[PDB]
């Protein structure tokens, strides 16, 4: 009967929990309590980027570490030259309620999406001077919340319909649909080798997916509330999550557990963006108290604070050469820190 | 100082900034609104009539209307899921929220009250006023006149309720429909006045699906809301 199936599922869950409990021999803090502390680190706002009309929800560094795409609720995508604070392109969108953007690794395309349930793709390098819509990918039921390019012809979208999809851009059809979540998916981080990707949803859980096979490999259930941000450690064997319970957590795919938790009694607002540095030593996280924080990823103590915004920090991104940090906020200002 | 190509790049950036200022001029002068409601509530009829007088899994629809040379945006969400707690943050700074409720469907009215309560107490919707369209009043007219479907059974406090002195039944109609509709209004208003804290208000209206005087109501309420915020920032209160 259905009760028998429920009992079998409960037994399997208990078995997984027991195996995880057996596999955990020592905490990360015990191993790391011998390494020297990172020390107080101070970053100063080298540049400020003015021009966005409304609040900023998205931002993604270019692979060249100099260009920068940004998304705001007014309906614009602005491509910045980070070194000179110039504006390269100003892309007006068909729907103003955008909540994610991405910059292609090649540099030829950008993508954006939001409450329109569509992940539009824009062609930056055309024979004509203007930037045009290459394709509009439709098929998601809820709002698109994050998109990351795999290459010029493949993109991965997470939506608020408990589903992530893998699109083929040339023919706008879903090669694979990743189901298994029960709440709205928010964040999405691709592995450096682009063979797996993690996703965090409102079910207070995260799943590691297989892009090729299309099947969930592991499910992680640390947080006590909906997960807002996720990102891979540069190794590819770890990731960190930021949720609404004012806690960051670090998981490991191989150990299939949670290694360390980043929380402070005097911070009680949820995290909105999480990113790592090049070495993985620093875990930069945005917060709702208008101030980004810098965590030592091996010790769980705040190395520094980035307070320069008059509203909550929504987006965060560390450049590929590890040289700077961009921080967008609901005050419509981007700041480059170094 | 800097090279010729960099000068041309700075010039292009300056032209982009000029276009952005032109866009800002029209952004600050357009008042954005969020339309909410249930499937039975005639918000589709409201938006269709507003558009007329003035796409498969699409998730948002936009409607321009203009009253006395003032621009208005109206957004309603089409393909979203049942959960609302996540995409409601994007409307933290709209001018007002238009909540439309069916007053002729006493079976689903408690769910509408709970939804209005969740909107009114959302942590991101503080200082956002709500325009309440108590809709489909004509249907409520028959529902109350003909006694086939009663109302005291769904709500066991209609008996101990009296029509308030402020009531103004204008056209000429039976006192029973006035009493019932003001009872529904006062349910929504007790939810509104429980925990307002003075930072936002609820403007109720007795509308029908096909009424011409809806954009005027939204215009008046938005006038009041902008006036209140201007009193706040210009240090009068």
């Amino acid at each position, epitope marked *: 009967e259905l009760d028998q199936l429920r009992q079998e599922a409960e037994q399997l869950k208990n078995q997984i929990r027991d195996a995880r409990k057996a596999c955990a021999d020592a905490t990360l803090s015990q191993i790391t309590n011998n390494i020297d502390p990172v020390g107080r680190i101070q970053m100063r706002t080298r540049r400020t980027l003015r021009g966005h009309l409304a609040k900023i929800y998205a931002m993604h560094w270019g692979t060249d570490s100099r260009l920068l795409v940004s998304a705001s609720q007014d309906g614009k995508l602005i491509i910045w030259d980070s070194y000179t604070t110039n504006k390269v392109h100003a892309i007006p969108l068909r729907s103003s309620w955008v909540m994610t953007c991405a910059y292609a690794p090649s540099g030829n395309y950008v993508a954006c999406g939001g409450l329109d349930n569509i992940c539009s793709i824009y062609n930056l390098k055309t024979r*004509e*001077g203007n930037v045009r819509v290459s394709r509009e990918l439709a098929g998601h039921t809820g709002y698109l919340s994050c998109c990351r390019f795999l290459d010029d012809n493949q993109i991965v979208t997470s939506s608020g319909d408990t589903t992530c999809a893998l699109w083929d851009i040339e023919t706008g059809q879903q090669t694979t649909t990743f189901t298994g979540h029960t709440g709205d998916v928010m964040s999405l981080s691709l592995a450096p080798d682009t063979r797996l990707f993690v996703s965090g949803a409102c079910d207070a859980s995260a799943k590691l997916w297989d892009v090729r096979e299309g099947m969930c490999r592991q499910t992680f259930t640390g947080h006590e509330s909906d997960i807002n941000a996720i990102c891979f450690f540069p190794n590819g064997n770890a990731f960190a999550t930021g949720s609404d319970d004012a806690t960051c957590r670090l998981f490991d795919l191989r150990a299939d557990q949670e290694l360390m938790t980043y929380s402070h009694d005097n911070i009680i607002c949820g995290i909105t963006s999480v990113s790592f540095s090049k070495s993985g030593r620093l875990l930069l996280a945005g917060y709702d108290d208008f101030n980004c924080n810098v965590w030592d990823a091996l010790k769980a103590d705040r190395a520094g604070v980035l307070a320069g915004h008059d509203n909550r920090v929504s987006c965060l991104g560390v450049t590929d050469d590890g040289m700077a940090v961009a921080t967008g906020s609901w005050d419509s200002f981007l700041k480059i820190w170094n | 100082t800097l*090279s010729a190509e*960099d000068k041309a*790049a700075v010039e292009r950036s300056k032209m982009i900034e000029k276009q952005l200022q032109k866009d800002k001029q029209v952004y600050r002068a357009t008042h954005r609104l969020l339309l909410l409601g249930a499937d039975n509530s005639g918000k589709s009829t409201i938006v269709k009539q507003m558009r007329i007088y003035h796409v498969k899994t699409s998730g948002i629809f936009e409607t321009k209307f203009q009253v006395d040379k003032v621009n208005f945006h109206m957004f309603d969400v089409g393909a979203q899921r049942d959960e609302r707690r996540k995409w409601i943050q994007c409307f933290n700074d709209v001018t007002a929220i238009i909540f439309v409720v069916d007053s002729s469907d006493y079976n689903r009215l408690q769910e509408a009250l709970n939804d209005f309560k969740s909107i009114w107490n959302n942590r991101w919707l503080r200082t956002i006023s709500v325009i309440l369209f108590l809709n489909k009043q004509d249907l409520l007219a028959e529902k109350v006149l003909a006694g086939k479907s009663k109302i005291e059974d769904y709500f066991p406090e209609f008996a101990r309720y009296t029509t308030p002195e402020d009531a103004t039944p204008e056209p000429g109609e039976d006192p029973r429909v006035t009493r019932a509709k003001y009872f529904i209004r006062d349910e929504f208003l007790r939810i509104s006045t429980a925990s307002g804290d003075g930072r936002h208000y609820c403007y109720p209206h007795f509308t029908c699906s096909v009424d011409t005087e809806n954009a005027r109501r939204i215009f008046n309420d938005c006038r009041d809301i902008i006036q209140r915020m201007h009193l706040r920032q210009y240090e009068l209160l």
Partner: single-chain antibody
Amino acid sequence: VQLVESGGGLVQPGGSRKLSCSASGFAFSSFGMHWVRQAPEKGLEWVAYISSGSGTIYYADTVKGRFTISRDDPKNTLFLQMTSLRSEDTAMYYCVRSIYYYGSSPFDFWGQGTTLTVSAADIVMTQATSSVPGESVSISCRSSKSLLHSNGNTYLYWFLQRPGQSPQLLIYRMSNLASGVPDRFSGSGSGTAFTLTISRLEAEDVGVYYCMQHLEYPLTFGAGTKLE
């Protein structure tokens, strides 16, 4: 994209003429336009430049007060008003499309050219060679002043004018292959001395190779190397 232009012919000395350049197939309003001329048997010489938005205009010191460049963005047209035409102002004038942002490729499209005949302290580029079917050929050019800026950009451009038609961009900023140029062409330099290297030459690569500096106005070209 295409840039068709007209308005040339025989003009008596001391007269005047207006050249027009009709653009179609690209967003004209976001491109800065140049006028480039070459004498009937001589090399290219830069004439004028109008910026996007008409905010910046430059002229050659040889036409500074007589010529006037102008554009009509809603009509997608480019003008060159010439007055006091001497016998040294005979050439065939080109319409060049240029855009400037981080990573753009200026001087990437050239018009067909219109011909005009008149009846009877800057950087200098020297291409010392003047002439040179499956073999590697290396061209070279030199400059008086270093073209390397403090940005790290070497503003050197390479153009190919096949025997019957207009110049075609091959390398911009000394090392970047233009869109559509085969990977056979490569460019290199050191700040003052430069070179272009065709790897496996084919019969469509014969013509005259021109160099350019975009470091500072006026832009200077160089005589050009012939391949036969």
